[PDB]
Amino acid sequence: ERPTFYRQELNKTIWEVPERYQNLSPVGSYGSVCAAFDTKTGLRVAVKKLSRPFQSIIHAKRTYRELRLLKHMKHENVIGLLDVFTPARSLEEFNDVYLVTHLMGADLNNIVKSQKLTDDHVQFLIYQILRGLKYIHSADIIHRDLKPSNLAVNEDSELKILDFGLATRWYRAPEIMLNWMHYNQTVDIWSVGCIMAELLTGRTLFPGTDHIDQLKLILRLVGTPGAELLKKISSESARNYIQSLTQMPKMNFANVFIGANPLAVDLLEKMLVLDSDKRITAAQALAHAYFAQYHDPDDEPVADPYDQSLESRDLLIDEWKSLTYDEVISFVPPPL
Ligand SMILES: O=C(CSc1cn(CCNC(=O)c2cccc(C(F)(F)F)c2)c2ccccc12)Nc1ccc2c(c1)OCCO2
Ligand SMILES: CCCCCCCCO[C@@H]1O[C@H](CO)[C@@H](O)[C@H](O)[C@H]1O
Numbered sequence: 001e002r003p004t005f006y007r008q009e010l011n012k013t014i015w016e017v018p019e020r021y022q023n024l025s026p027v028g029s030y031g032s033v034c035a036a037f038d039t040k041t042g043l044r045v046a047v048k049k050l051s052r053p054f055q056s057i058i059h060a061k062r063t064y065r066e067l068r069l070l071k072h073m074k075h076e077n078v079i080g081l082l083d084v085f086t087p088a089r090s091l092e093e094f095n096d097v098y099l100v101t102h103l104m105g106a107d108l109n110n111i112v113k114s115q116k117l118t119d120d121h122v123q124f125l126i127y128q129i130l131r132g133l134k135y136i137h138s139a140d141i142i143h144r145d146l147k148p149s150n151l152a153v154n155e156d157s158e159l160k161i162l163d164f165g166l167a168t169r170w171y172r173a174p175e176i177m178l179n180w181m182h183y184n185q186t187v188d189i190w191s192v193g194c195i196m197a198e199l200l201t202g203r204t205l206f207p208g209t210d211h212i213d214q215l216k217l218i219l220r221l222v223g224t225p226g227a228e229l230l231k232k233i234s235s236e237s238a239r240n241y242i243q244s245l246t247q248m249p250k251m252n253f254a255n256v257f258i259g260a261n262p263l264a265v266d267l268l269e270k271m272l273v274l275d276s277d278k279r280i281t282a283a284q285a286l287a288h289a290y291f292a293q294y295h296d297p298d299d300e301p302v303a304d305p306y307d308q309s310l311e312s313r314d315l316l317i318d319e320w321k322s323l324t325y326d327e328v329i330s331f332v333p334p335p336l
């Protein structure tokens, strides 16, 4: 049962892995990531060494949460695990945790290189994002920081959503920029809109220099809050500030996306509405005619509810450590 391990030093860091995994090579910035080859399956893989996983309660808690999350995410368009291992033989020697996933090689910038894509390519890429989003949203998880650097893409444009990555605010919902503390899943839809817009045009939709400039760019496009949106703002100061603004009309999107598929323009109008309750959901979007060539109602799976309460307890360091260890022990590789 216990595979044989071997040690070796990469970028000043000691890595201890099973023998199945050969030709380890660092690819960058928890911890550190090497591409490797998995001789057990024939697959190229990325391997992550968690950095200092059980050094403080907060490190411990974050480790547990990353492990839990990834073990529950099983979907073509969401990052998942092929393996999870520790050199340790027992809870007492347990101080390292390594996560294995399929090599993707590149994120969405790497694949796009600020260039305009064809409408077909655009449909395919956004479709996968929405298909992945539908899945995460069904588990009652909101991503909150969807951006191209949080999207793994390989040579054939097969795309996955990421928990954390390896400009950072250009994709954020305006309600997130303003630190509201109730949020819809549609904060994520907002981010899809900005991504899509960029892919159709070649240009960043809202390239602010800073927090306020970004909010000014957003207001130019989608106009100032109208009457329905105002009565939903509880903060009295926020409220008065907004009214103090000279009202501006929504731009028409046909003027902004000159010659794009009018179906592309339509969907984007449904993604980028200022009021979040009024934005298309990921499930409604997947049914939008723009994705006619890719939409399959029978292959857009949904997740079981993910208990977020287990991860936001206040446990001692050894409790988290032991719970993470069980999670390592109980792991089962996907069918392959
Ligand atoms: O291809 C992959 C796997 S998908 C990916 C994830 N991330 C977030 C960083 N996390 C990991 O890489 C990671 C590794 C193991 C386990 C896990 C866990 F989340 F826990 F499952 C995550 C990426 C960032 C950029 C591009 C792809 C990815 N990685 C990879 C491949 C080639 C690269 C590269 C990274 O860096 C650029 C040089 O070439
Ligand atoms: C909903 C509450 C919003 C508070 C934001 C108000 C603070 C914005 O103050 C802003 O700073 C910039 C110059 O420094 C300018 O671009 C703006 O015109 C100016 O009003």
Ligand SMILES: CCCCCCCCO[C@@H]1O[C@H](CO)[C@@H](O)[C@H](O)[C@H]1O
Binding pocket: 174, 175, 180, 181, 182, 183, 184, 219, 225, 229, 232, 242, 274, 275, 276, 277
């Ligand atoms: C410049 C003013 C920006 C307006 C941002 C509000 C648009 C988001 O929409 C609102 O946001 C909240 C989600 O956090 C919800 O509580 C509200 O129900 C929803 O209307």
